[PDB]
RNA sequence: UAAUCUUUGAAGAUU
């Protein structure tokens, strides 16, 4: 629901990290990974996540699966302007 | 989720 092109690539939650791991139920990993924007978030590996503090396998799943779909929206220039 | 928590992220727990 909140795992959707639409929702994940909405510009006001990728400009506000907290928020946009709120809406995946993640916040937990905020303090881990709010210092990443999410330009250079979207694009961190499995290896890393984890050295940041993502130590729930399940987690790291989802947040590839959420970065994925972020970076098929930017490689086909879907993601508006404005969270640039 | 009404809310909060857990990871397995579809479910479980608590109030």
Do not use: C, Q
Not at 45 to 53: A, M, P, Q
Not at 55 to 84: C, M, N, Q, T, W
């Amino acid at each position: 629901s909140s795992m959707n092109p639409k929702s994940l690539t909405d510009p006001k939650l990728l400009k506000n990290i907290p928020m946009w791991l709120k809406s995946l139920r993640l916040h937990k990993y905020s303090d881990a990974l709010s210092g990443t924007p999410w330009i250079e978030l979207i694009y961190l590996d499995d290896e890393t996540l984890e050295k940041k503090g993502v130590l729930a396998l399940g987690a790291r799943r989802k947040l590839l699966k959420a970065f994925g779909i972020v970076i098929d929206y930017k490689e086909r220039d879907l993601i508006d302007r404005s969270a640039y």
